[PDB]
Structure formats: C-alpha cells, structure tokens
Amino acid sequence: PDSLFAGLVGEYYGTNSQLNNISDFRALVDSKEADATFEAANISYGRGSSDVAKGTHLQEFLGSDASTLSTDPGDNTDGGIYLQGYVYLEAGTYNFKVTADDGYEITINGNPVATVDNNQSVYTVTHASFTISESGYQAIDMIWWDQGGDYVFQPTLSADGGSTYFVLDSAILSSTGETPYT
C-alpha cells in the first residue's frame, strides 16, 4: 500500500562524484536506494549555501517538507531530489517558470516541459507552453540537483499565459492520484 498525501513522493540521493547534467543525476537515482525519502508538499526549496548534501543543508532546503524525512543523510559533496506523483490541472495551456541552482527536468504525462541540462548559479527560466488535454490528476515527475555551492529550486506554473504563477503544493498535489483529504 502506498501513502496517500497531498504532495509528491520525494527521494533524495547524495554522491561524492560530480553531477554535471540530468543524465548524471538520473544514473545516481538508478544506482542505489534513496538516501532519504520525504513528502514534497510545498515545492519551493532553498536558497542556501555551502552544498545541499552537507550537514543540515538538505533540511534547511526542504523547509516545511523536512519534517517528513525518513532519515538524516550523511555528508556527500553533491546531491539532488527525484519527485514523482500527480498534480490536478484542468484542460488548457500552461507554462513553467523555474528558479534553480543547479539544473533540473520536469515531465508531465511522460513529456519534458522544463529542462536545464547543465550546472548554473541561480537563474530563472520562463519555459515554453504546453497543453493538458483532459482535466484531472496528471502524472508529474521532477529531478533537481546541486553539484556544490549554492542551491535553490522553485518551479512555478502559470495557467493564464504567464500573467500569474503558483507554487505546486498541497492544494493540487497527490501522491497516488486519489483525492487527498489531509
């Protein structure tokens, strides 16, 4: 049985190898069990300094979501998160606008909708629009990582052509695609 909560299923992975791109982080995820799990109910993390994977920086980064960590990971040089679950969206057009250090990839219903395939100091990208064909819970996943230094990850989403943006949070997230009443 999988937990039903108003959030995405979160996994954290650390490494002492360099993360340069999405492929490197995805290979890390494939290579082992998560170093920690958590509920990603308020997806606006950071900003902090001095490596996400060191000390209590992950806790600080995750903030309101850190109380759901399964463990306190030990130190690593590099690290990142893999989030998966569902997001309620009505049919229509949307676009992400993401602030991040380092890179990331967001997919909805199996298609990338926001990609930065490289390391970077803090930068905000307004991504191209995509369509949702049928109202309801859409499949979503995210990866983000820190190669070292500062760290921040705030995907925001617009339903109104980029006039207003919102954080993905417990209003619309579901871990399993069932309706959460939490």
Ligand X SMILES: CC(=O)N[C@@H]1[C@@H](O)[C@H](O)[C@@H](CO)O[C@@H]1O
Integer Cα distance of 11 and 29 in angstroms: 9
The binding track of 146-165 with respect to ligand X, each residue x by CB under 6 A or -, is -xxxx---------------
Among 35, 39, 65, 102, binds Ca ion (CB under 5 A): 102
| Per-residue DSSP letter, 73 | -
Contact 10, 40 (CB under 8 A): yes
Site string (96-125) toward ligand X, x via CB under 6 A: -----xx----------------xxx----
Q: Please report the DSSP string for 1-64 in residue order.
A: -PPP-SSEEEEEEEESS---SHHHHHHHHHHS--SEEEEE-B--EEEE-S-TTSTTHHHHHHGG
* Count of residues of this chain found to bind ligand X when the rule CB under 6 A is applied: 9
Task: Name 92's bridge partners.
Answer: 132
175 is an annotated ligand-binding site residue: no
Among the listed residues 65, 148, 153, 173, the single contact to Ca ion using CB under 5 A = 148
Using CB under 6 A as the binding rule, whether residue 21 contacts ligand X is answered as no
Contact set with Ca ion (CB under 5 A): 18, 29, 72-73, 77-78, 101-102, 146-149
Contact set with ligand X (CB under 6 A): 101-102, 119-121, 147-150
